[PDB]
Design a protein around this ligand. Structure first.
Ligand code: HEM
Ligand SMILES: *[C@@H]1O[C@H](CO)[C@@H](O)[C@H](O)[C@H]1NC(C)=O
Ligand SMILES: *[C@@H]1O[C@H](CO)[C@@H](O)[C@H](O)[C@H]1NC(C)=O
Ligand SMILES: *[C@@H]1O[C@H](CO)[C@@H](O)[C@H](O)[C@H]1NC(C)=O
Ligand SMILES: *[C@@H]1O[C@H](CO)[C@@H](O)[C@H](O)[C@H]1NC(C)=O
Ligand SMILES: [Ca+2]
Length: 595
């Protein structure tokens, strides 16, 4: 009966068992269960999947099969009546830099990725889905409600393909459909180095023995390195401007060019590896390429861990932080470090932190050129605006001096994402991330809002007035009840995100509980955690506690004026101090003693 069994598409890997380095796949982290938290296995189920047919059909598939006696609302109707807003005045977060939003996307991309099924290649099925809006198999299109302005302009539907699932990726009947996590569950910089050998080697410089990561040979940022291009076709970064013909970037994660500020962040992280690999050589000229790579990799993975757990999670979770992520008490090998299916939705609170524009700023933190500020939607899959228009430095200044959007019950998701999203294969800046999120909840068999409230030991509202008391909002609760008819049926992404934020944080109680658990588990369940005794030397760890996002920018750009605390709102030159002030990474404790 014990289904430890199923998992056909995985090349079972032997473990070295006393190696000082993480694998690329994340395999061999846990000794008793070596697959635990490895890429290309099922997302963990904190609660049983919920499907129309108990097995695989998403709720809403059959237009006649109620959920608890009620029809589920169209995702695009929920989007339009709740998530959407016109007025970008008053929407900005007075105490979060745009870097707060950006770091979130980075950590999300380190932890999880459930890609679309690849069944449709050399087929018209993707076309027949998009072209004809015909629900079938892995085609689950987002249909427009009547009165939707997109009806008049785009067609009857937005296209949507169900996420990949384990064992068979085609045939019928499994305990329940389980979607894949294609990256490593550990906070291990997999987004820089890859989660597969195949890509991890292609990423590396294997012409020389300095342990360097490949760099662009076509283009340079004032002598500073760019990510190598991705010479695969069709390139969506080419598609968005066929005259510039600047391809998408190649990184450890396939998503690195989805928007110019994520591509930017990816560029900071690569340089930091190269900068480390050449410093390690300096001190230890006797070291080979492999040793340099792995030893640079290991520093960077520690860096992301510290920035995330010390700087980021306290200003997400606020008052709830200590309650879910109590201070570190060493490696526990009985902790599941796997990313849960519900986490990959919980973390999409990020979508309401994305504001409608991006600025480029000069060395005086003033407007860079006559189109310094641009709409978010023109920067999907846009690498040319980096190559042909100032390098990363003017964009890294905008991440310091501009603001994240604040979540708002009346202003959830900017139209730049809710109406104008571009997706690689489809042709138009005409999609809805909110609608996508909701269809995806259903596709993944997500339990409803009260199941999750129940799971987190929170009250479970059954009426309008219960829902009003929890949401502290009569109109939002009303619109929700009008759409869902019972709070039991509310899709967890919007249910969770409707909740007012906890003191000193940027999520409500339900999210703080779901996020809190997951981040506690990936820290506690990780054999290679930086503070885990025996991973670093006690001296290396005093050197490590001094890292800052301030310093990473200083070391890896030509910017000399930084805030101390890069995630809080910071204004220039008041909150901006010189780079010689911040603190460095002393790499002396990595000095190799031959004797
Ligand atoms: C301009 C900014 C962003 C864009 C354009 C964007 C776009 C997307 C898209 C297209 C998806 C795939 C949706 C699906 O097919 O179901 C997605 C998923 C996701 N996004 Fe965002 N996003 C942005 C910012 C963020 C931020 C700031 C965070 C977190 C703080 C975040 C977290 C996620 C997560 C967790 C997923 C699911 C990934 C997975 O496990 O498959 N995103 N995003
Ligand atoms: C590898 O490193 C060498 C020396 O640093 C450099 O000249 C070369 O361009 C690099 N190769 C690639 C493919 O990036
Ligand atoms: C295309 O990129 C080129 C730079 O090669 C730029 O001059 C042009 O204005 C861009 N056009 C669009 C539509 O993005
Ligand atoms: C701004 O954010 C930081 C980070 O949470 C916090 O400690 C600080 O008290 C906040 N300041 C104001 C004035 O809100
Ligand atoms: C390890 O975690 C389990 C459950 O995850 C818990 O019961 C136990 O207290 C922990 N054990 C140690 C050794 O920390
Ligand atoms: Ca990872």
């Amino acid at each position: 009966s014990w289904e430890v069994g199923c998992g056909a598409p995985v090349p079972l890997v032997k473990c070295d068992e006393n190696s000082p380095y993480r694998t690329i796949t994340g395999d061999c982290n846990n000794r008793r269960s070596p697959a635990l938290g490895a890429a290309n296995r099922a997302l963990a189920r904190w609660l049983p999947a919920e499907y129309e047919d108990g097995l695989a059909l998403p709720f809403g598939w059959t237009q006649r099969k109620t959920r608890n006696g009620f029809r589920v609302p169209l995702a695009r109707e929920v989007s339009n009546k709740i998530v959407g807003y016109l007025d970008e005045e008053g929407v900005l977060d007075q105490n979060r830099s745009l870097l707060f939003m950006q770091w979130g996307q980075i950590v999300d991309h380190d932890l999880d990725f459930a890609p679309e099924t690849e069944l449709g290649s050399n087929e018209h099925s993707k076309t027949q889905c998009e072209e004809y809006c015909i629900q079938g198999d892995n085609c689950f299109p987002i249909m427009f409600p009547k009165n939707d302005p997109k009806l008049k302009t785009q067609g009857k539907c937005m296209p949507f393909s169900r996420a990949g699932f384990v064992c068979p990726t085609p045939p019928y009947q499994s305990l329940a459909r389980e979607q894949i996590n294609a990256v490593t569950s550990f906070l291990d910089a997999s987004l820089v180095y890859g989660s597969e050998p195949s890509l991890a080697s292609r990423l590396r410089n294997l012409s020389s023995p300095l342990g360097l990561m490949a760099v662009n040979q076509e283009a340079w940022d004032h002598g500073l390195a760019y990510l190598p291009f991705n010479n695969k076709k069709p390139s969506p970064c080419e598609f968005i401007n066929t005259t510039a013909r600047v391809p998408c970037f190649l990184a450890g994660d396939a998503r690195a060019s989805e928007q110019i500020l994520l591509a930017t962040a990816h560029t900071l992280l690569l340089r930091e590896h190269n900068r480390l690999a050449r410093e390690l050589k300096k001190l230890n000229p006797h070291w080979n390429g492999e040793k340099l790579y792995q030893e640079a990799r290991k520093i960077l993975g520690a860096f992301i861990q510290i920035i995330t757990f010390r700087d980021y999670l306290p200003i997400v979770l606020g008052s709830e932080m200590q309650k879910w992520i109590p201070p570190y008490q060493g490696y526990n090998n009985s902790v599941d470090p796997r990313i849960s299916n519900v986490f990959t939705f919980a973390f999409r609170f990020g979508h309401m932190e994305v504001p409608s524009t991006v600025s480029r700023l000069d060395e005086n933190y003033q407007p860079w050129g006559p189109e310094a500020e641009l709409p978010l939607h023109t920067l999907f899959f846009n690498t040319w605006r980096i190559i042909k228009d100032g390098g990363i430095d003017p964009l890294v200044r905008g991440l310091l001096a501009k603001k994240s959007k604040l979540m708002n019950q009346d202003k959830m998701v900017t139209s730049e994402l809710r109406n104008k999203l571009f997706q690689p294969t489809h042709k138009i800046h005409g999609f809805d991330l909110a609608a996508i999120n909701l269809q995806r909840c259903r596709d993944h068999g997500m339990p409803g809002y009260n199941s999750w409230r129940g799971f987190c030991g929170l009250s479970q509202p059954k009426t309008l007035k219960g829902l009003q008391t929890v949401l502290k909002n009569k109109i939002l609760a009303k619109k929700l009840m009008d759409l869902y008819k019972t709070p039991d049926n509310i899709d967890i992404w919007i249910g969770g995100n409707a909740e007012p934020m906890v003191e000193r944080g940027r999520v409500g109680p339900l999210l703080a509980c779901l996020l809190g658990r997951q981040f506690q588990q990936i820290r506690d369940g990780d054999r290679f955690w930086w503070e885990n005794p025996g991973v670093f030397t006690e001296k290396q760890r005093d050197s490590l506690q001094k890292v800052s996002f301030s310093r990473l920018i200083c070391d890896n750009t030509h910017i000399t004026k930084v805030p101390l605390h890069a995630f809080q709102a910071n204004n220039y030159p008041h909150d901006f101090v010189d780079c010689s002030t911040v603190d460095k990474l002393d790499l002396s404790p990595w000095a190799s003693r031959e004797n």
